[PDB]
Amino acid sequence: IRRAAYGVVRYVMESGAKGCEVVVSGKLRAARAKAMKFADGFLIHSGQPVNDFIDTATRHVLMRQGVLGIKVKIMRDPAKSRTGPKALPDAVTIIEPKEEEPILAPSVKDY
Amino acid sequence: RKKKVYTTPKKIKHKHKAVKLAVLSYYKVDAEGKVTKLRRECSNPTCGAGVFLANHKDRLYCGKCHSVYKVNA
RNA sequence: UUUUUUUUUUUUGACAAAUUUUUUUUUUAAACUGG
RNA sequence: GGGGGGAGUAUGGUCGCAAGGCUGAAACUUAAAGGAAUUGACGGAAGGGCACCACCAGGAGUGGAGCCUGCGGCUUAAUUUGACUCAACACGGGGAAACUCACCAGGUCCAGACACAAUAAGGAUUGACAGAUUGAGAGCUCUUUCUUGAUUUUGUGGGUGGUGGUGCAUGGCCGUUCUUAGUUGGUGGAGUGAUUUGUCUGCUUAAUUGCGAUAACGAACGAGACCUUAACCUACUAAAUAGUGGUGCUAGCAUUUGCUGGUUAUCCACUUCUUAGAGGGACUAUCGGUUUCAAGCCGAUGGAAGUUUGAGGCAAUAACAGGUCUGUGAUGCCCUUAGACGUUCUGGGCCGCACGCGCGCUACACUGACGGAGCCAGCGAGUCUAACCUUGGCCGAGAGGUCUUGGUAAUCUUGUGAAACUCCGUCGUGCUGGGGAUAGAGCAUUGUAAUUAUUGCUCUUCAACGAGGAAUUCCUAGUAAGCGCAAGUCAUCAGCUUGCGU
């Protein structure tokens, strides 16, 4: 379980994701169920940007002992987003100004 | 629910087993060689002279029909 | 002119036995001519 | 001194009319007892904040009465069952006449795939008229004798199904901890270590929100930001599926040129009202006052809008043996699998009543009841190979019927002409013309079917209840409370819920 799941998170990070998270829940190696979660990067799950940048999937895998639950959340970064918003709502970018010349040579140029 | 009592009389009875008689297809045979109809054919246009009308008691009953052909005699 | 300055307390006993246990995986990317 | 007890006990000695000191075992029993510190939890410990699921000031009540609705109990052939503090009890979208349905009394069917073996073309097998029989027009089973033909039957293994069990074996979903502000890495520092600091004295905020302080620095999730919705736009884009004005034609009254109307597109023009795309708009703006002079807070003005503008949606880390196997062709294990726990059909039950509880409805009247008269919404839903929402005419006291019509919908139902409310009158402090439980008789409607009243209507019957003890719930502004309406469930049934307006 720990090898199959760390091989999925590292592939999604290799694919240019900003954060993804894999949860395996069920009777993993005992008779009493636990839940293991494997994560890298960061994920936002707060609001409308969840509808924009989060992709989720739930899968039922059928095992000898019972059923395990697979949950994968992937947060694609907004920089490579083609449509819709291209940044998180609280991300501000300041355009860097170009410095000017002080004296500016008081004169006239004509045509 | 723990068990069943079956207050009905102890009937594991089943249907008649499509009762297995001996060979029966016999019009009648005379000597060399003719045959004539007994248990006569039906008046159905869709029974093309191949069905035998059983005579139980004052009844003529066809089995090609699901239920009922009554040419009583 | 060290100058500032909320005074308090009635009654509240008890809750049977046992329990919940996590270990480090790659030995597997190892294949080349001598003309 | 040499693990904890037994035990400073027993015995002997000694100090002795005393309490009792001093000296001092063993048998037996036991897997820890203990020390210091850490993180939580808890405190009838303290300090600082916060919340109408807390109180204060109050409002509306509930608890008292009748009913109808869940739960317990009792009863029963069965009254199927889960859930029991918040976080079970109008909850399972659970308003069950059949179906649902899991329960009870009974009857059919296999929908037992495939593989092997047997029977078997001198027929493996299937179906049936009438009668018996049966609740039954079930050929169930029997009497009878036709039909069928290789798919079935029998046996051995399996297969399949199960609202059968286990939610303490699980998945998913959901509730709750938890209407709050909380949580965690990386590198550095402290400590042998568990851990700790970062994540903080103070002030501030709805907020681990900030100002700042600082053995920490730089970060991540949560909060915020975000999205939806409600308010503003005489601004843009134009609308016979929304309007307005003029114009023709026309009605009434006044007549003087006016007022009120009608005219499905008569025509023209426009977009204030309506619709919906793109936008604008609030940032606590301006001023004043306060604090360390910061983050902020308070008051006034302006403004459609000054509580985070109002309301939501979304929503961390860790968890609970919380609920659900009765949502699932989600599922492990167990059980059952042909006289079945599968499935289906007739009946019945889930509604049965000495009684206790929870959510509610109607009331106890004059701020009222009754009768006329006025007349005002918003959210929505609606039928093609199927009968949905129904206008209008006619009939009927009413419920309802019938003949037609419009609508697949900003077009028609529908301006949903809702109810409280308002005006005028009758009543007159009397359980009375308040209240309408219980009950009788009739007429209809839905349905295959209405008995154990489905529901509607008409006449009659006229119960308790005179403001509800201890307790206890919800609530801070277009809110509480009053008042109805649409939708869900639905064929019929709303005293329920989800919304909406007044």
mmCIF file of C-alpha atoms in Angstrom, chain A residues 19-69:
data_model
loop_
_atom_site.group_PDB
_atom_site.id
_atom_site.type_symbol
_atom_site.label_atom_id
_atom_site.label_comp_id
_atom_site.label_asym_id
_atom_site.label_seq_id
_atom_site.Cartn_x
_atom_site.Cartn_y
_atom_site.Cartn_z
ATOM 1 C CA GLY A 19 -0.155 19.445 -4.834
ATOM 2 C CA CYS A 20 -1.912 16.085 -4.661
ATOM 3 C CA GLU A 21 -3.075 13.788 -1.892
ATOM 4 C CA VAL A 22 -4.020 10.093 -1.848
ATOM 5 C CA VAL A 23 -6.097 8.504 0.926
ATOM 6 C CA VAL A 24 -6.400 4.747 1.418
ATOM 7 C CA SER A 25 -9.051 3.777 3.956
ATOM 8 C CA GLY A 26 -10.137 0.300 4.955
ATOM 9 C CA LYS A 27 -8.812 -2.744 6.738
ATOM 10 C CA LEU A 28 -5.271 -2.325 5.493
ATOM 11 C CA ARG A 29 -3.362 -5.058 7.319
ATOM 12 C CA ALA A 30 -5.526 -5.700 10.396
ATOM 13 C CA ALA A 31 -9.100 -6.596 11.256
ATOM 14 C CA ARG A 32 -9.814 -3.064 12.509
ATOM 15 C CA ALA A 33 -9.959 -0.393 9.829
ATOM 16 C CA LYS A 34 -7.527 2.511 9.673
ATOM 17 C CA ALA A 35 -6.904 5.261 7.134
ATOM 18 C CA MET A 36 -3.550 6.205 5.619
ATOM 19 C CA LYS A 37 -3.057 9.438 3.694
ATOM 20 C CA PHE A 38 -0.127 10.286 1.428
ATOM 21 C CA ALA A 39 0.487 13.874 0.393
ATOM 22 C CA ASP A 40 2.945 16.175 -1.323
ATOM 23 C CA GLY A 41 2.851 19.792 -2.360
ATOM 24 C CA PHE A 42 -0.104 21.670 -0.949
ATOM 25 C CA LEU A 43 -3.830 21.567 -1.567
ATOM 26 C CA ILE A 44 -6.478 24.216 -1.037
ATOM 27 C CA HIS A 45 -9.896 23.110 0.016
ATOM 28 C CA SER A 46 -11.790 26.199 1.172
ATOM 29 C CA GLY A 47 -14.137 27.640 -1.410
ATOM 30 C CA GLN A 48 -14.856 28.420 -5.050
ATOM 31 C CA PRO A 49 -11.201 27.688 -6.043
ATOM 32 C CA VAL A 50 -11.955 24.074 -5.098
ATOM 33 C CA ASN A 51 -14.354 23.997 -8.035
ATOM 34 C CA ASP A 52 -11.565 25.439 -10.212
ATOM 35 C CA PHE A 53 -8.322 23.693 -9.276
ATOM 36 C CA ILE A 54 -9.299 20.465 -7.456
ATOM 37 C CA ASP A 55 -10.001 17.201 -9.244
ATOM 38 C CA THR A 56 -11.296 14.369 -7.064
ATOM 39 C CA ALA A 57 -12.006 10.701 -7.633
ATOM 40 C CA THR A 58 -13.312 7.935 -5.384
ATOM 41 C CA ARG A 59 -12.791 4.266 -6.206
ATOM 42 C CA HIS A 60 -13.913 1.054 -4.513
ATOM 43 C CA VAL A 61 -11.228 -1.627 -4.749
ATOM 44 C CA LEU A 62 -12.347 -5.157 -3.902
ATOM 45 C CA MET A 63 -9.886 -7.157 -1.841
ATOM 46 C CA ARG A 64 -9.673 -10.509 -0.097
ATOM 47 C CA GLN A 65 -10.216 -8.974 3.333
ATOM 48 C CA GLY A 66 -12.980 -6.605 2.256
ATOM 49 C CA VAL A 67 -13.222 -3.259 0.461
ATOM 50 C CA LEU A 68 -10.663 -0.465 0.539
ATOM 51 C CA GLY A 69 -11.478 3.113 -0.404
#
